Amino acid sequence: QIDRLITGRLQSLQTYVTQQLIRAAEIRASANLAATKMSECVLGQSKRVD
Amino acid sequence: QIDRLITGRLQSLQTYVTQQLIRAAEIRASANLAATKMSECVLGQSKRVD
Amino acid sequence: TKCTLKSFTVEKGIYQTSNFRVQPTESIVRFPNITNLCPFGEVFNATRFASVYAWNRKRISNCVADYSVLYNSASFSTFKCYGVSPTKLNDLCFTNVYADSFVIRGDEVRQIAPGQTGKIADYNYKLPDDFTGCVIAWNSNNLDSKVGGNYNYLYRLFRKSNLKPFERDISTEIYQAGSTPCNGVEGFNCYFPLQSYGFQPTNGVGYQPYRVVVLSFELLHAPATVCGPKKSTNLVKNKCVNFNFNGLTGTGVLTESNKKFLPFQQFGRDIADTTDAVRDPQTLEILDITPCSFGGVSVITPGTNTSNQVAVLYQDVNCTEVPVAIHADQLTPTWRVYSTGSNVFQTRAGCLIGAEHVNNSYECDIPIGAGICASYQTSIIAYTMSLGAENSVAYSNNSIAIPTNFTISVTTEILPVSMTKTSVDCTMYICGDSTECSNLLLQYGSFCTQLNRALTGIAVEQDKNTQEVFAQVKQIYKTPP
Amino acid sequence: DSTECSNLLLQYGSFCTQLNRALTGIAVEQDKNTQEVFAQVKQIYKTPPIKDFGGFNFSQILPDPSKPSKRSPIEDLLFNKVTLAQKFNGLTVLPPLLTDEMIAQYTSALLAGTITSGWTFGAGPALQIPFPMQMAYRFNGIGVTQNVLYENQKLIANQFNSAIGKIQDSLSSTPSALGKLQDVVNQNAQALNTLVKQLSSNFGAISSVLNDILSRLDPPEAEV
Amino acid sequence: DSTECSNLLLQYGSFCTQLNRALTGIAVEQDKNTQEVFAQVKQIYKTPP
Amino acid sequence: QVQLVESGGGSVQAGGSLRLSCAASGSISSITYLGWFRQAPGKEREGVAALITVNGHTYYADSVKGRFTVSLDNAKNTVYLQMNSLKPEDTALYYCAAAAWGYAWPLHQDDYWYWGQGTQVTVS
Amino acid sequence: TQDLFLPFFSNVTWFHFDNPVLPFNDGVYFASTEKSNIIRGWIFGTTLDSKTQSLLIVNNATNVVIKVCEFQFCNDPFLMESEFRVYSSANNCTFEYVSQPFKNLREFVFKNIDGYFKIYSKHTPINLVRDLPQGFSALEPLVDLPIGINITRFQTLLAGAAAYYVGYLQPRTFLLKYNENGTITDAVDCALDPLSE
Ligand SMILES: *[C@@H]1O[C@H](CO)[C@@H](O[C@@H]2O[C@H](CO)[C@@H](O[C@@H]3O[C@H](CO)[C@@H](O)[C@H](O)[C@@H]3O)[C@H](O)[C@H]2NC(C)=O)[C@H](O)[C@H]1NC(C)=O
Ligand SMILES: *[C@@H]1O[C@H](CO)[C@@H](O[C@@H]2O[C@H](CO)[C@@H](O[C@@H]3O[C@H](CO)[C@@H](O)[C@H](O)[C@@H]3O)[C@H](O)[C@H]2NC(C)=O)[C@H](O)[C@H]1NC(C)=O
Ligand SMILES: *[C@@H]1O[C@H](CO)[C@@H](O[C@@H]2O[C@H](CO)[C@@H](O)[C@H](O)[C@H]2NC(C)=O)[C@H](O)[C@H]1NC(C)=O
Ligand SMILES: *[C@@H]1O[C@H](CO)[C@@H](O)[C@H](O)[C@H]1NC(C)=O
Ligand SMILES: *[C@@H]1O[C@H](CO)[C@@H](O)[C@H](O)[C@H]1NC(C)=O
Ligand SMILES: *[C@@H]1O[C@H](CO)[C@@H](O)[C@H](O)[C@H]1NC(C)=O
Ligand SMILES: *[C@@H]1O[C@H](CO)[C@@H](O)[C@H](O)[C@H]1NC(C)=O
Ligand SMILES: *[C@@H]1O[C@H](CO)[C@@H](O)[C@H](O)[C@H]1NC(C)=O
Ligand SMILES: *[C@@H]1O[C@H](CO)[C@@H](O)[C@H](O)[C@H]1NC(C)=O
Ligand SMILES: *[C@@H]1O[C@H](CO)[C@@H](O)[C@H](O)[C@H]1NC(C)=O
Ligand SMILES: *[C@@H]1O[C@H](CO)[C@@H](O)[C@H](O)[C@H]1NC(C)=O
């Protein structure tokens, strides 16, 4: 019974940190995109459209 | 009891292949950055700063 | 939406709360042509049965035995079934359906029982302990009683040992009880075992015989041959209903088919192994199996500050059974006007209740899907969305338009760059300060190591992202005062 | 549709709201991706009926009103080359917000903008320029003087018309150029099939049907 | 190599199938990765002597 | 699994009529044979009436034939026994009994019966 | 599907006069090529005497018989228009069944799974005088028998000479092809070459 409830909360914790890491990949890509926005809009002229 | 053994090692392999594939996604995004950086900075003269 | 979205104020959009199901109604049941007719009429309607020295262990096989005609035969005296009830005798069967027959004398029918010996159980016929099957006694006064006594069924009252259960007792030689041997001519200790049942018309109803057949059910490693019959309903078509055919079952819709089965199948499957067609075994007609329809509810609101009216979309469902897809008779009369009414519409996404279709085209505001959007213009309208303003500006090979006036305007652009860092301790989250649980958790190895090392990684990588996005300057720069 | 399994699902917490919020997140990402790629232009431009482009040829790729799809016949063969979804076990396919005819109308609007107006509509209004003027402008971006096109306009138009016509020939005789759309279809189809095929696993029980578990066992002992 | 474990492992179905194509997808994606990073010139040029 | 609580006993003179009722609680669907027993003072417990729940067929004893009847009421899960033309040889303890093993005539004491608590029927 | 089959390009035996006693070995693929009807049926059983139960199948002029009893199989079982000296034993019968049956080729598969005895049958025309021809055929179950006896050997029977082919079955892995009408058009063995792997 203790094994049931412990593997339940481990599976809950793994699916939580699964959600955390997959949004971490997206927000890392978004932050690298925004760093490219700061470098190619703040530090100089962009000839690239929109 | 062999089933408890099965669930433990199968969940460890599951979080292993999860971490492996999400680190492959990060190395994929870095490789797209490396591909556009080499094919812009090496094969021609860019005007983008930093 | 107020209960599911955890608010009393619900902003304009599309939301999904629950689903809907259509239910089976009649629960139809089919069985094949049972119709094989075992020869039990000769062991229920004959004037001379077997003897108790010659009760044959006959193998009746590869047919069906009706027992519902036994209950309405209106002649039974001591219908006895051990092991299984005679009420559920016809539907369920077992193997080894060997049968017996004798016209036993009615005084000691009740002595034939598991765990009870006697003189009929000791010298004529013995039942084993935990019998599965039936022994069936009835009044048979009108036929096995001739003038002066029916001396056709000789019997044995004398034998050396006790009966083994279900034992063939056949003999002509006489019982041995003394020490002086017999000389062929019958003497004082010869004891001829084959005396006579006297079955006279002057006997009483307990003294007149009770005619017994035995439906013994054993269990060997052989498949069953003879069972009871199966009752079957009719089949309903074009309706979500539970079905149970000859072994296979399910819930779904039976429609007509178009494919051609070969003459040996009875059902069909498809790609990824689900049933889709069936042939009934009483008509030999191929019937397509369609599952019962379902879908989720989508509700359209323009905002709780703005209106109180709602629009309800039932997705990918035919827009005729939508009041009876839901339990509209069980809900409130408030829910009843969103199950039927004049404002009904079927889209490509499904049936929409609560809006009217507008032929005019407007800008999309609420995304439903497949080109149709909704808005509020004081009632809820439904419309195919408009892409924008058309433009056919005059192409000319020798004319250029050049602007002479300028606009200075700016456009906001928003991107998230960071996360509030969160880490958890594994061990007392999982256990909550228990010694044996912590002795269990280190005994799950090192899951805490990957867990804490990965959840440190989100914080340190987010710190690197913030360090990249906001430090590209060597110094601190300042403006003139 | 088991009552007692859903009664014992209530003591597994709130897994299903995280699963449902994960799966509707896929749908809003797909709608956001298609809205980001193909809804970029404010108005809907149209090609003129009299197509006087100075000898240049765009007849392969302008949309065809003879077809009832109103669709250009190069991407009709792109639709033809891709070939493969069923509804059971609570699985469904919710339809896209943008239908394919509005996708084709958006591609016609982008094509009408990039031929008739140049790139002026991408930053402002549709400024009307002709196409040999447009090619002479784009030559000045890469260091080519305007005069060599205007002395060789028919040769550029003929070689561009011959090169555009080989695009249908290069796609029509190659069966593996469209693998980058086919592999996503094969991957999510095999993933859905794998989700179908794991409904026939006992997972430690006697039989994979719940009714044989319910019938042949005691219901406090069919719980395990 | 224990048989009743595999009698419990196949009773847990085919988790092995999508973890194997997920791991194989890493390998073929990494070959496409190094092809997409390093192999872009149509020919090979050499230095003058 | 079968519990029987009966009533309907009492006192009446000769020529009167009473109405015995035996209520069943528990496994109603396994009950297939309802027999009525009777034990006179100084005499063995014998059989009087019988009823099959499946068929509705009645088996009647020879001393109660033409006067005693049994009916089935499946709405209340009760069996009814109506005793008309009473005579003072019927003063006995009357028992109701249920069978889940089939129907057997005449009634025997050694069979497996779910028994009742007994109501006294007195006539003089 | 994981099931027992004939492996592809396996060796079968070929006889012609000639009727030996051959073992069973979990399933027999039986083939027979005829111009005139010589092969009648078989004798099945374990020891083929008056101790263990033996099964008998005989085809004749209009019908067939399928019967398992306690028999006495002769040393030379064989069957102008009539000859019958295959057995003289009628004791302890259990089951009986009546059905209705080089230019003709008959291909038979006999098996025993969970006490059930399944018969596979398909008639095809073949026209050459050396061996079995090439091609593909899909082989149809007709009658499943509820006998449930044990069997390790068998023997065929004949009445002009005729040739028959006997093969054995192995538990293998096969990949099947289904058409629109649900028949088998082609099949490959999953142990022949790496191409079929
Ligand atoms: C299994 O049992 C059922 C019921 O006995 C059989 O159904 C019966 O089949 C016959 C022949 O197909 C039907 O006769 C036909 O009747 C129509 C109308 O009377 C007539 O126009 C035809 O010319 C033909 O004579 C018969 O009506 C039908 N009975 C019922 C109740 O549907 C069924 O055939 C049996 N299965 C097999 C495989 O034999
Ligand atoms: C280029 O664009 C700008 C703004 O889009 C134009 O400026 C606007 O010009 C009009 C015409 O004079 C101004 O309207 C008048 O303003 C005076 C105040 O000086 C007022 O008394 C009049 O009743 C009338 O409203 C307008 O204010 C002015 N806009 C601004 C922000 O000052 C400009 O004229 C354009 N260039 C050309 C060549 O058209
Ligand atoms: C642009 O190119 C297309 C294709 O090369 C031309 O269409 C051809 O027109 C001729 C004459 O009408 C037909 O015989 C061909 O069958 C057409 N080909 C196809 C593939 O349809 C078109 O004429 C060209 N445009 C102009 C203005 O000449
Ligand atoms: C025996 O015959 C009688 C009348 O001849 C009939 O009522 C009864 O049903 C028959 N028994 C059976 C088992 O059919
Ligand atoms: C309701 O809120 C929306 C924005 O959330 C706003 O545009 C609208 O005007 C509001 N209506 C009222 C009556 O405040
Ligand atoms: C919906 O059901 C009605 C019932 O007659 C049918 O006529 C109609 O064609 C159905 N609509 C669709 C789209 O299947
Ligand atoms: C809208 O379109 C339908 C479809 O033909 C037409 O019958 C109707 O008259 C149109 N106008 C209005 C106002 O509904
Ligand atoms: C079949 O038998 C022959 C000789 O009896 C042998 O040479 C041949 O290799 C065998 N076939 C196979 C596939 O082993
Ligand atoms: C007949 O065969 C059965 C089956 O084994 C056996 O039990 C029985 O003794 C046999 N009887 C005789 C007379 O051989
Ligand atoms: C038949 O033989 C097998 C093995 O030879 C044995 O396991 C089985 O019990 C036998 N069957 C009978 C009915 O004796
Ligand atoms: C399947 O059956 C139809 C029925 O007419 C026939 O036309 C078709 O040729 C058949 N196909 C095959 C592959 O046998």
Short recap of the structure:
This is part of a larger assembly, with 6 copies of chain A and 1 copy of chain F (124 residues). By secondary structure, chain A is mainly α. In chain A, 80% of the residues lie in helices and 0% in strands.
Describe the protein's architecture and organization.
- This is part of a larger assembly, with 6 copies of chain A and 1 copy of chain F (124 residues).
- Chain A has 50 residues and is mainly alpha-helical.
- Chain A has 1 helix and no strands.
- Helix content of chain A is 80%, strand content 0%.
- Chain A is rod-shaped.
- In chain F, strands 2, 4, 5, 6, 9, 10 and 11 form a 7-stranded mixed sheet that branches. A 4-stranded antiparallel sheet of chain F has the order 1-3-8-7, with no helix packed on it.
- Chains C and D meet through strand 14, strand 19 and strand 22 of C and helix 2, strand 1, helix 4 and helix 8 of D.
- The complex binds a molecule of 3 linked components (NAG-NAG-BMA) (2 copies), a molecule of 2 linked components (NAG-NAG) and 2-acetamido-2-deoxy-beta-D-glucopyranose (8 copies).
- Chains A, B: This is Spike protein S2'.
Largest interface: C-D, 36 and 41 residues
> In CATH, what is the homologous superfamily of chain F?
Immunoglobulins
List cofactors, ions and other ligands.
a molecule of 3 linked components (NAG-NAG-BMA), a molecule of 2 linked components (NAG-NAG), 2-acetamido-2-deoxy-beta-D-glucopyranose
What is the class of chain F in the CATH system?
Mainly Beta
Element order of chain A: H for helix, E for strand: H
Summed up, the domain count of chain F is 1
**Backbone CA Rg of chain A:** 20 Å
The class by helix and strand makeup of chain A works out as mainly alpha
Strand content of chain A: under 5%
Radius of gyration of chain F: 13 Å
Q: Give the termini distance of chain A in whole angstroms.
A: 60 Å
Family (chain C): Belongs to the betacoronaviruses spike protein family.
Region (Receptor-binding motif) (chain C): 139-210
Subcellular location (chain C): Virion membrane; Host endoplasmic reticulum-Golgi intermediate compartment membrane; Host cell membrane
Region (Disordered) (chain C): 21-37, 157-192, 221-243, 323-342
